[PDB]
Amino acid sequence: IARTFYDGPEKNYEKTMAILQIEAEKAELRLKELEVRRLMRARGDGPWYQYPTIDKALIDHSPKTTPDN
Amino acid sequence: GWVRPDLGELSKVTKVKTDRPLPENPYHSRARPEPNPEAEGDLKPAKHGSRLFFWTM
Numbered sequence: 001i002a003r004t005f006y007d008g009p010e011k012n013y014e015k016t017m018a019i020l021q022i023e024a025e026k027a028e029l030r031l032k033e034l035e036v037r038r039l040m041r042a043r044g045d046g047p048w049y050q051y052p053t054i055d056k057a058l059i060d061h062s063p064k065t066t067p068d069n
Numbered sequence: 070g071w072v073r074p075d076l077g078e079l080s081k082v083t084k085v086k087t088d089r090p091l092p093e094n095p096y097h098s099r100a101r102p103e104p105n106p107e108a109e110g111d112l113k114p115a116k117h118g119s120r121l122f123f124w125t126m
């Protein structure tokens with residue numbers, strides 16, 4: 001029965017080791033992502049949570065018919 | 070000996086040769102803040118896929 005239907009215990013051992021490693025990395029990545037999102041929403045200096053401003057190319061730098069401006 | 074200007078002459082854009090230095094900052098502007106640095110490097114596939122709940126990709 002063992003020869004025909006099942007395998008050795010080392011197979012399951014190493015499989016669950018790999019599964020545990022994968023899940024641990026995923027958990028760490030999730031926590032790091034939450035922290036990064038919080039920090040970049042608070043500060044706004046990151047790529048995410050960038051809100052549009054007024055483009056400076058719309059300004060007209062020419063004489064305005066009055067000397068002051 | 071004065072000649073009256075013709076039509077279209079007094080409305081010309083004329084050059085002026087002066088000695089007054091060109092102002093460096095006529096608007097008295099402050100120092101512009103440093104921008105967000107850049108996006109750098111090539112794109113690599115996401116580690117362990119979406120990592121959303123039980124989905125493995």
Ligand SMILES: CCCCCCCCCCCCCCCCC[C@@H](O)O[C@H](CO[C@H](O)CCCCCCCCCCCCCCC)COP(=O)(O)OCC[N+](C)(C)C
Binds near residue numbers: 004007
């Ligand atoms: C010796 C006589 C006295 C003792 C009798 C003992 C009785 C034992 C027989 C009863 C069998 C119990 C059913 C359990 C089936 C397990 C299914 C699965 O686990 O087997 C897979 C494969 O299946 C097997 O090949 C068996 C499949 C056969 C299904 C049994 C159904 C027989 C019922 C009879 C029906 C009669 C129909 C009549 C029609 C009219 C294994 O997956 P695999 O990853 O590949 O192999 C891993 C091991 N390796 C790598 C070393 C090879």
